Each structure stands twice: as structure tokens, then as C-alpha cells.
């Protein structure tokens, strides 16, 4: 039904979408609340890894505390958690079809999960659209870290994103990423 | 929910679990028309299963079925609630000649029943459907769980096999199939 936790998620996350950074700050004891948030991030990371068939999580409280990632968490309004998306700027070398490496630092989509029970009901788009508005980035400016097959379809459906230059580094970028690509 | 199709699934598959092989025989319109419906169902299930396990391509399809010794057990929705019927998921199995290391790393030529592909629609995962389907297959195949080899098990599947059949400790292999203590 969702990710259920043995504590008052509503009290902790009063908003439907909660944005947290490396500080994992409780929305306005400090210690007990913050521990609850770390548990949520740990469990979300595990669930996302099971979903994408990863042998280990790529998102955790520990990894959040030591990076400059931003996580957007979607709460179930029916007290449980429905899913999240994690983003961050990363220094990448991107190939440009003259086959040269270009050092860039785009916003990257790093991890993304919606509970199986409510996948394909528009919640992924809900979070993605919120993140786009908050980060003030256009979808074609993004790089995606190891997109899943579901995510590739999602990006093409909602944002008309079509891959551009194939990459060797497991990031994916789309038409519009390069300066000469700006068709409306 | 479930997987829906532009034809009457309940008429095509009268039974809760339908077992099909390379012949793609309609269960007890024209014959070829019903076979086309079956092929469509197998193709679509294969694609869904690949998306579910984050595979870059389907490992199950009508054409692949027709040219192999694989057997598919397809579970239809039997709910009293949902008008053309719906498919919940499937499991595909086949005997394969394998060379498996035992617990002394000695090589053993075996031909176990292998679990090759397995998928339950996301909307109803974790509701016991996979267990029902797995158990039906074991009974019809007359195989015990520890006697199975698993092709490239996903993380969800490893948890599933431990929970339901107490299959947890593996005997390490060099070849991407997985077997459990007790196989020998
Ligand atoms: C960089 C990364 O994070 S890679 C990891 C991405 N995460 C995963 O793959 C985990 C499993 N999947 C999920 O958690 C979700 O499906 C997400 C996050 C990929 C998408 O969120 P949803 O809530 O499922 O998407 P939403 O309902 O908003 O959009 C639906 C669209 O996504 C795509 N999509 C979602 N599920 C599927 C599916 N099972 N098969 C194919 N495409 C799918 C389709 O384009 C679909 O549109 P359609 O129904 O018209 O075909
Ligand atoms: C050889 C191959 O086929 S590898 C590919 C296997 N297929 C996939 O990974 C595709 C996606 N997953 C699925 O289609 C299904 O989850 C299956 C086929 C693995 C299992 O079917 P379900 O109908 O989900 O199983 P069922 O409800 O019968 O059993 C539940 C158990 O499976 C495991 N399981 C199911 N979903 C999850 C999950 N999201 N995270 C961790 N474990 C899970 C758990 O052990 C769970 O028991 P629990 O709820 O007490 O923890
Ligand atoms: Na999933
Ligand atoms: Na899945």
C-alpha cells in the first residue's frame, strides 16, 4: 500500500512533498525526529534498490550526510510514504559526438522510486514536476545516472526526452543538452 | 489492477493458471486467431517482466517460446470486482543442462528445473500471487524448491525464496545460475 513506518510521519513531514538536503533537517526532541528521518531515507534507499534490482542501495542517510544531494519525499495523504526522487549537481565528462570529453556540471537525477502499489498513477510525474520547478531546470538540461527502462519511457512520455549522443560513463543525456540543440 | 488486452482474456484462458509451451495451444474464434492473442499476451508479459527487473531487453517472448523447451504458467485475475479479464503475471521454467559447483567446488553435471523469468504486476505485488503461482508450478512439475536452479535471481526474488521456501544459503557458482544448500 505504501512504505509504512512505526511513527507519526504526518507530525514529522507536515507537507505532501518534503525537500531535504544533507542536513536532513526536521521541518519546522531534535534527536528523535532526526533519527526518524534517517530511518526513512535508509528504508527508501533499500526499497528503491529492490525496485530497480540493484545489489545494494545507492541512497542512504549516511550517503546523504556526506554528499550535496537533495531528496524530495512524497507522503501518502490517506502517514505512510509513497516515494522520493534524489537529485544533485555532479561533475561529469560528457562525450559530444565529435567524440571528445566535455567537463560539465549538470543537475543529475540520481535515484527515484514510487511504491509498487501506486506506480503508474502519476506520482512520479508529480514529484518530478515539483523538483523541476524548485530546481529551476529544464528537463533536457538533466543528466541521468543509470536510468532504468521504466525511467527512460517515463522521460520520453512526460517530457519528450529523446537520447542524444551515446555516453560511455553510464550517465544519459538528451537532445537539448548541447548548445546548438534548442528547438522549441 | 493488472494487464489488460483488447480481447476477451477470460474466454481465452478459462482457468486461473494456464500452462503453455512451444505449441501455444489455446485451452479447451479461429484457432490461429486465438494463438495470435496468446502470442500477444506472452510478448507483452515478457516486455513487462523485463521492465520490472530493469533488464535492457525481454527474455521472454512468443517467438522465443516457439523455439525452446520453456514452459509458462500464466495467472489471470480471478477477482470478483474488475470486463474482458486481466493477466496478473507468469512464471517461466525449463530444464537446462548445467555444470554446477558443489560445496567443495567440484563440478557436477546436472539437469535441474530452472526458474527463468517470473513477474507479478506491480499493482498487486506482495499480495501472495507470486507464491500461489510458484506453488502451482512446483506441484505440476513435481519438483521440490531446493532442487531448483535460478537464472540470475533479482533481489526481490532472493527475498521471496527465503521467505516462502527457506532458501537462503547459496552454493557459490561461477556462471550466473544460483542454487541453494540442499541441491545436492
Ligand atoms: C536515475 C534513477 O533513479 S533509475 C531508477 C528509476 N526507478 C525505478 O526504475 C524503480 C521502479 N519504478 C518506479 O519507481 C516508477 O515507475 C518511476 C519512478 C520510474 C516512475 O513513476 P510512476 O509513478 O511509475 O510514473 P507516472 O505514473 O508518473 O508515469 C507513468 C509513465 O512512466 C513509465 N512507466 C511507469 N511504469 C512503467 C512500466 N511498468 N513499464 C513501462 N513504463 C512505465 C511510462 O512512460 C508511463 O506512462 P504510460 O502508463 O502512459 O505508459
Ligand atoms: C529468475 C527470475 O525470474 S528473476 C526476476 C524476478 N522478477 C522480478 O524481480 C520482477 C519484479 N518482482 C515481481 O514480479 C514479484 O515481486 C515477484 C515475482 C518477485 C514475487 O511475487 P509477489 O507476488 O510479489 O510475491 P508474494 O506476494 O507471493 O511474496 C512476497 C515476498 O516476496 C518478496 N518481495 C516481494 N516484493 C518485494 C519488495 N518490493 N522488496 C523486497 N521483497 C519483496 C518478499 O520476500 C515478500 O515477502 P514480505 O512481504 O513478507 O517481505
Ligand atoms: Na518496481
Ligand atoms: Na517491479
Swiss-Prot record, chain B:
The record marks 53 as: Crucial for catalytic activity. Residues 3-184 form the N-acetyltransferase domain. It is found in: Cytoplasm; Membrane, Clathrin-coated pit; Cell junction, Focal adhesion; Cell projection, Axon. Changing residue 177 to A: Strong reduction in activity. Acetyl-CoA binds at residues 118-131, 154-163. Transmembrane segments: none annotated. Changing residue 64 to A: Strong reduction in acetyltransferase activity. The modification N6-acetyllysine is found at residues 51, 140. Autoacetylation strongly increases tubulin acetylation. It comes from the Eukaryota. Specifically acetylates 'Lys-40' in alpha-tubulin on the lumenal side of microtubules. Promotes microtubule destabilization and accelerates microtubule dynamics; this activity may be independent of acetylation activity. Acetylates alpha-tubulin with a slow enzymatic rate, due to a catalytic site that is not optimized for acetyl transfer. Enters the microtubule through each end and diffuses quickly throughout the lumen of microtubules. Component of the BBSome complex. Interacts with AP2 alpha-adaptins, including AP2A2, but not with AP1 gamma-adaptin (AP1G1/AP1G2); this interaction is required for efficient alpha-tubulin acetylation, hence clathrin-coated pits are sites of microtubule acetylation. Belongs to the acetyltransferase ATAT1 family. This is Alpha-tubulin N-acetyltransferase 1. It comes from Homo sapiens.
Amino acid at each position: 500500500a505504501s512504505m509504512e513506518f512505526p511513527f507519526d510521519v504526518d507530525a514529522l513531514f507536515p507537507e505532501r512533498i518534503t525537500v531535504l538536503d544533507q542536513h536532513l533537517r526536521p521541518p519546522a526532541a531534535r534527536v528523535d525526529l532526526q533519527q526518524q528521518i534517517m530511518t526513512i531515507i535508509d528504508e527508501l534507499g533499500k526499497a528503491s534498490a529492490k525496485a530497480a534490482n540493484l545489489s545494494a542501495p545507492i541512497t542512504s542517510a549516511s550517503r546523504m550526510q556526506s554528499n550535496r544531494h537533495v531528496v524530495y519525499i512524497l507522503k501518502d495523504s490517506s502517514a505512510a510514504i509513497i516515494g522520493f526522487i534524489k537529485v544533485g549537481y555532479k561533475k561529469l565528462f560528457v562525450l559530444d559526438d565529435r567524440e571528445a570529453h566535455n567537463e560539465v556540471e549538470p543537475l543529475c537525477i540520481l535515484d527515484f522510486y514510487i511504491h509498487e502499489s501506486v506506480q503508474r498513477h502519476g506520482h512520479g510525474r508529480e514529484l518530478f514536476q515539483y523538483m523541476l520547478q524548485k530546481e529551476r531546470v529544464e528537463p533536457h538540461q538533466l543528466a541521468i545516472d543509470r536510468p532504468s527502462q521504466k525511467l527512460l519511457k517515463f522521460l520520453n512520455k512526460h517530457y519528450n526526452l529523446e537520447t542524444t549522443v551515446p555516453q560511455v560513463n553510464n550517465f544519459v543525456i538528451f537532445e537539448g543538452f548541447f548548445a546548438h540543440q534548442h528547438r522549441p
